[PDB]
Amino acid sequence: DLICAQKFNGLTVLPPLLTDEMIAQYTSALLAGTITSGWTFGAGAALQIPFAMQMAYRFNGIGVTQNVLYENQKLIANQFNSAIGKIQDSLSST
Amino acid sequence: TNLVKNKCVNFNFNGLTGTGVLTESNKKFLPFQQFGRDIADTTDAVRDPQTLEILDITPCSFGGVSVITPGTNTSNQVAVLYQDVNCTEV
Numbered sequence A: 001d002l003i004c005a006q007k008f009n010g011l012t013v014l015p016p017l018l019t020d021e022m023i024a025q026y027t028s029a030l031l032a033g034t035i036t037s038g039w040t041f042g043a044g045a046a047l048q049i050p051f052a053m054q055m056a057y058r059f060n061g062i063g064v065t066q067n068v069l070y071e072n073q074k075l076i077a078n079q080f081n082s083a084i085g086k087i088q089d090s091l092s093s094t
Numbered sequence B: 001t002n003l004v005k006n007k008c009v010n011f012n013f014n015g016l017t018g019t020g021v022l023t024e025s026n027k028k029f030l031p032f033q034q035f036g037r038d039i040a041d042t043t044d045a046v047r048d049p050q051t052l053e054i055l056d057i058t059p060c061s062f063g064g065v066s067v068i069t070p071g072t073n074t075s076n077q078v079a080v081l082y083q084d085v086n087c088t089e090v
C-alpha cells in the first residue's frame, strides 16, 4: 500500500502533532462554549447564558428583533433539528 | 544459504536481490508466479524457491533521530526519540 512502500525509500509520514482524538476535544470545547456561553468565551472567561437567550442576540445581530424568536421558538426548534438531520444524508448519501 | 526469518538480512532469491525483513505471509500466489509487488513497483513479497512459501519483504526499519532537549542552558541531559521503530533495534 502507500503505508510502507513510500517508507521503503526514505519517504516518511510523520504523525500530526495533534491526534484526531485531541482535535475532537477542541471542536468539543469550541462547540461546548458556543452552546452554553454564547460568543463571550472568545473574548475572555466564558459566561453561561440561556441558549434561547443567546439566539435572541444573534437575531439582533441580523436585524430581526428578538420578539420573533421568543414567539417562534418552538417552530425554530423544529426547523433547526430537521435541518441538522438532512446534514447527515447530505454527507451520508453523496 | 540458510534462510533468515524475523531478522534484517541481505538476500538473494533466484537472482532477485535486496535487503529486508523476511517473514511468513498469507498472500496467495498462483503456481507459475515468482514475485509479488506493491503499488510502488517495489519488490514486496517473494516466494522461497526451495520450499514454496510466501515471504514478505519489509526493509529494515529506519527513522529520524530526534534529540529532545531543554535548553542547553538548563541542562546537558537529552532524551533521544527514535522515530517510528519498535523498541528493539536500539
Ligand SMILES: *[C@@H]1O[C@H](CO)[C@@H](O)[C@H](O)[C@H]1NC(C)=O
Pocket: B086, B087, B088
Ligand atoms: C515494541 O517493543 C515493545 C518492547 O520494547 C513491545 O512491548 C511492543 O509490543 C512492541 N510493539 C510492536 C509494534 O511490536
